[PDB]
């Protein structure tokens, strides 16, 4: 489980849409929107939540969604909690008989899915427009 998050954060074929690679299909990702099927190809640029011609100023609901999307805390949280559950389940070999440590592990796995599942929801929410 710890592999498939840290792969998915550090890879960038998240979305197949059409958009500008320089500033027209996109090798679009969670951090770096990249581009395929163009005259220029293989250049990956930094993504940008845009305040220039924004049309969401003084929104209560969007200003929460801008922060959570482009600073993707929830898939980052879904890595660390999945990593923290990995250390408690690694610590059952040595320093065992504590008999509490895998519940402390297993809640961190279940939490890491609840972090992961809402990281999908904020991702589908923001890119729609």
């Amino acid at each position: 489980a710890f592999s498939l998050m840290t792969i998915a954060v550090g890879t960038d074929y998240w979305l197949y849409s059409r958009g500008v690679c320089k500033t027209v299909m996109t090798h679009s990702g969670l951090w770096r929107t990249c581009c395929l099927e163009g005259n220029f190809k293989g250049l990956c640029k930094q993504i940008d939540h845009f305040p220039e011609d924004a049309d969401y100023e003084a929104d209560t609901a969007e200003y929460f969604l801008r922060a959570v999307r482009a600073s993707s805390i929830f898939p980052i949280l879904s890595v660390i909690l999945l990593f923290m559950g990995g250390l408690c389940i690694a610590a059952s070999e040595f320093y065992k008989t504590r008999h509490n440590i895998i519940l402390s592990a297993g809640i961190f796995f279940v939490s890491a899915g609840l972090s992961n599942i809402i990281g999908i929801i904020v991702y589908i929410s923001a890119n729609a427009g």
């Binding site: 809640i107 279940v110 609840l114 599942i117 929801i121």
Partner: protein
């Protein structure tokens, strides 16, 4: 189909070289009038209308006025400019100005069409949330509390079956009875009351109208739009209709006909048909209804007529002024019209080539039942 090229032209000879509506109608009138006849084709391939400063007609009637041709049996519009200097017999076919546009796509409902009123991100996020709930309702109901963890009936497999029971709203076998068990059982109940109701509210929306509404069928929006350019045949009586408009929307039609860059007037009708097919909504063509009938009755079947006719003009058998044959010609047409001959000829060419042959007028009523083809998916 007024004159069509016969397949065996180089085999056959004379008037048998051609086959068409007028070719049949010429044979019918020559029986009743009793004259030998020899068909020809105009060299212009055009309709005779007037030159600037010259009045010399370039087309069939210019071959008819000037002693070259004797009888003109053709889809020739009886307009005032022609009849003041040629004769017409009484008309043989009724028609008017009408529009050809491409019906774009058929797009009947697929077999998994019932899943449509929710998007496929939602169904994916439902299944993720269904697993996400049922693992949490397991984890709560199985802790260190003799074997008093067993007092909760919720293993994980009863947990998947509870939340499936709560989602499909088909009741449930048991119920959580802890405090934190009833929280997850309560929230998932509030979840499924929104989602299943958002399904049934939106599926009522798909079950009245799921089709296409025609963009320019009112014919005043057709004159309106600057994206949808509209044209007609050059030196055609449709163009000659709008040059003397007295209706205000028809006054605006001629202005964009005049002020289109480049010329939307196409050199033939068949090339004008092929322009709208290439356009895909970008261009419209204006043509006669009986000329727009045969376009629908041929493959690729993607041409259809919107609105009624814009007017009511007619076609005529044409003769020169003072042509002595033209009066038994004129008595022939009233004989052919009453004997059902002309309608039978209007039948034959315009149905038997109904390769498309659909006659799909449409079940217009929005109070129409579900069909088994619409809900075939859940049985699969």
């Amino acid at each position: 189909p007024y004159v069509m090229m016969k397949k065996n032209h180089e085999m056959l000879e004379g008037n048998e070289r051609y086959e068409g509506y007028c070719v049949d109608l010429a044979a019918e009138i020559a029986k009743h009038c009793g004259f030998k006849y020899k068909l020809t084709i105009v060299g212009d391939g055009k309709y005779g209308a007037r030159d600037a400063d010259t009045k010399i007609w370039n087309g069939m009637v210019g071959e008819l006025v000037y002693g070259k041709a004797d009888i003109a049996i053709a889809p020739l519009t009886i307009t005032l400019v022609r009849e003041e200097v040629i004769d017409f017999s009484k008309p043989f076919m009724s028609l008017g100005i009408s529009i050809m546009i491409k019906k774009p796509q058929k797009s009947k409902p697929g077999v998994f069409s019932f899943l449509d009123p929710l998007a496929y991100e939602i169904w994916m996020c439902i299944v993720f949330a269904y697993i996400g709930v049922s693992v949490v309702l397991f984890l709560v109901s199985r802790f260190s509390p003799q074997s008093s963890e067993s007092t909760n009936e919720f293993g994980i497999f009863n947990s998947l079956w509870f939340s499936l029971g709560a989602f499909m709203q088909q009741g449930c076998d048991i119920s959580p009875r802890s405090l934190s068990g009833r929280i997850v059982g309560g929230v998932w109940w509030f979840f499924t009351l929104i989602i299943i109701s958002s399904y049934t509210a939106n599926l009522a929306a798909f079950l009245t109208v799921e089709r296409m509404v025609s963009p320019i069928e009112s014919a005043e929006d057709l004159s309106k739009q600057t994206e949808i350019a509209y044209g007609t045949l050059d030196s055609g009586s449709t163009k000659e209709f709008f040059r003397r408009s007295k209706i205000a929307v028809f006054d605006k039609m001629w202005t964009y006909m005049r002020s289109a860059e480049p010329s939307v007037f196409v050199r033939t009708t068949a090339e004008g048909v092929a322009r709208v097919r290439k356009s895909k909504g970008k261009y419209a063509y204006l043509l006669e209804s009986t000329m727009n009938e045969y376009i629908e009755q041929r493959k690729p079947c993607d041409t259809m007529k919107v609105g009624g006719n814009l007017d009511s003009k007619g076609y005529g058998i044409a003769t020169p002024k003072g042509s002595s044959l033209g009066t038994p010609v004129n008595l022939a047409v009233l004989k052919l019209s009453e004997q059902g001959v002309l309608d039978k000829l209007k039948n034959k060419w315009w149905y038997d080539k109904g390769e498309c042959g659909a006659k799909d007028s449409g079940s217009k009523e929005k109070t129409s039942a579900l069909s088994l083809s619409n809900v075939a998916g859940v049985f699969y």
